Write a protein that binds this ligand. Sequence first.
Ligand SMILES: NC(=O)C1=CN([C@@H]2O[C@H](COP(=O)(O)OP(=O)(O)OC[C@H]3O[C@@H](n4cnc5c(N)ncnc54)[C@H](O)[C@@H]3O)[C@@H](O)[C@H]2O)C=CC1
Ligand SMILES: NCCC[C@@H](N)C(=O)NCCCC[C@H](N)C(=O)O
Ligand SMILES: [Mg+2]
Ligand code: NA
Length: 259
Amino acid sequence: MALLTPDDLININMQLQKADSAVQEVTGLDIKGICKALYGTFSSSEKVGIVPVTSGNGIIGNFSASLHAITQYFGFDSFVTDMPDVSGYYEAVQNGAEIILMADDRTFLAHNLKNGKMANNQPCTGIIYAEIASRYLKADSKDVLVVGLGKVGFPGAEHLVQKDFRVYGYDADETLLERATSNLGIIPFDPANPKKFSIIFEATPCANTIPEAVLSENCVLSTPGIPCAISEELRDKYEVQLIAEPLGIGTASMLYSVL
Ligand SMILES: NC(=O)C1=CN([C@@H]2O[C@H](COP(=O)(O)OP(=O)(O)OC[C@H]3O[C@@H](n4cnc5c(N)ncnc54)[C@H](O)[C@@H]3O)[C@@H](O)[C@H]2O)C=CC1
Ligand SMILES: NCCC[C@@H](N)C(=O)NCCCC[C@H](N)C(=O)O
Ligand SMILES: [Mg+2]
Ligand code: NA
């Protein structure tokens, strides 16, 4: 279970600002602009109730506080309930929450009580990070490499295929790889004979998943994964334009997806 740790969420504002500027530099739009382009929707400072959950491994330090800052950053009227779990859910609804935002170890959801729409963090994160990669201004071809085809990677790959991109996929689990290639029609990437990419989407909980033989100078690496798919040196060597942020972007995707 590759879950957030409290230290991933240290000064979430500075992380989200730098990611926002990176998205601006890469796509020409900010995270808000991406969300608008994706869902055709906009914020109206909605009231979102953040409910801490003690289920499974329990409350993660900085989690509900980071969600508060993220929602505030995107101009939402958010609050964290005093009580957790069902008691916290009750408090949220009582205090006039329009969107409930809550997570256990397997599901992080956003539920708009007004319109009945509900978002899952995994597909929402996959779609937005793939969307950002796809909107790279300085891309010469529609070739996109996807590494990691799990709960985040598969929806992201699907989104790229549906946008008529040439999608190359790899996953260390070949069951998931062969199940992805048949269901999506993606070209199975072979690391034995690689090619260079200008657009790369990685959704893996591991480091060093993107080899040097895959990189081209100024390429885009869009990755929600923790830690970093590429080494510090390989990032400098190829001046890789990096889109990586622990919570805010995927949360923005969830919120705008239910508006
Ligand atoms: N930054 C954000 O906003 C968010 C980040 N995440 C992170 O994204 C990552 C992926 O999440 P999920 O897709 O739910 O996990 P998952 O386990 O469903 O998918 C990960 C996939 O990557 C594959 N993989 C692992 N190591 C690999 C390697 N060395 N080479 C190729 N493939 C490899 C696995 O076989 C698996 O299919 C996790 O690290 C998670 O913490 C998740 C949600 C939001
Ligand atoms: N990466 C974006 C966050 C989704 C997921 N990767 C995760 O860490 N889920 C665990 C969250 C558990 C929250 C906890 N129950 C709390 O309320 O603090
Ligand atoms: Mg994110
Ligand atoms: Na990774």
